[PDB]
Amino acid sequence: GNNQGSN
Amino acid sequence: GNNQGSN
Amino acid sequence: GNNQGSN
Amino acid sequence: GNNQGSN
Amino acid sequence: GNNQGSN
Amino acid sequence: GNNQGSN
Amino acid sequence: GNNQGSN
Amino acid sequence: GNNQGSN
Amino acid sequence: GNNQGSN
Amino acid sequence: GNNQGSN
């Protein structure tokens, strides 16, 4: 799996 | 902001 | 903002 | 599965 | 699975 | 911001 | 900011 | 698995 | 900022 | 696994 986030 | 993910 | 995902 | 969101 | 989010 | 992921 | 991940 | 985040 | 990861 | 974060 892959999880990517940006704020 | 909030980013949450699960695999 | 909020982003939530699940697989 | 794929989950994508943007705010 | 893939989870991607941006705020 | 907050980024959280789990595989 | 906070970044947290687990594999 | 991969977890990536940026604030 | 805080960065935390576990494998 | 890989965990990467930046603040």
Curated annotation (Swiss-Prot), chains A, B, C, D, E, F, G, H, I, J:
Q: Which domain of life is it from?
A: Eukaryota
Question: Which tissues is this chain's protein expressed in?
Answer: Ubiquitously expressed. In particular, expression is high in pancreas, placenta, lung, genital tract and spleen.
Which modifications occur after translation, per UniProt?
Hyperphosphorylated in hippocampus, neocortex, and spinal cord from individuals affected with ALS and FTLDU. Phosphorylated upon cellular stress.
Where in the cell?
Answer: Nucleus; Cytoplasm; Cytoplasm, Stress granule; Mitochondrion
Functionally, this protein is described as follows: RNA-binding protein that is involved in various steps of RNA biogenesis and processing. Preferentially binds, via its two RNA recognition motifs RRM1 and RRM2, to GU-repeats on RNA molecules predominantly localized within long introns and in the 3'UTR of mRNAs. In turn, regulates the splicing of many non-coding and protein-coding RNAs including proteins involved in neuronal survival, as well as mRNAs that encode proteins relevant for neurodegenerative diseases. Plays a role in maintaining mitochondrial homeostasis by regulating the processing of mitochondrial transcripts.
Question: Which disease annotation does the entry carry?
Answer: Amyotrophic lateral sclerosis 10: A neurodegenerative disorder affecting upper motor neurons in the brain and lower motor neurons in the brain stem and spinal cord, resulting in fatal paralysis. Sensory abnormalities are absent. The pathologic hallmarks of the disease include pallor of the corticospinal tract due to loss of motor neurons, presence of ubiquitin-positive inclusions within surviving motor neurons, and deposition of pathologic aggregates. The etiology of amyotrophic lateral sclerosis is likely to be multifactorial, involving both genetic and environmental factors.
**What does the UniProt entry state concerning the protein's domains?**
Consists of an N-terminal domain (NTD) and two tandem RNA recognition motifs, RRM1 and RRM2, followed by a C-terminal glycine-rich region. Contains a nuclear localization sequence and is mostly nuclear; however, its nuclear export sequence permits it to transport mRNAs to the cytoplasm and even to synapses as part of neuronal granules.
Q: How does it assemble?
A: Homodimer. Homooligomer (via its N-terminal domain). Interacts with BRDT. Binds specifically to pyrimidine-rich motifs of TAR DNA and to single stranded TG repeated sequences. Binds to RNA, specifically to UG repeated sequences with a minimum of six contiguous repeats. Interacts with ATXN2; the interaction is RNA-dependent. Interacts with MATR3. Interacts with UBQLN2. Interacts with HNRNPA2B1. Interacts with ZNF106. Interacts with CNOT7/CAF1. Interacts with CRY2.
Question: Could you tell me what this protein is called?
Answer: TAR DNA-binding protein 43
Which source organism does the UniProt entry give?
A: Homo sapiens (Human)
Species lineage: Eukaryota, Metazoa, Chordata, Craniata, Vertebrata
* Included range, full protein: 300 to 306 of 414
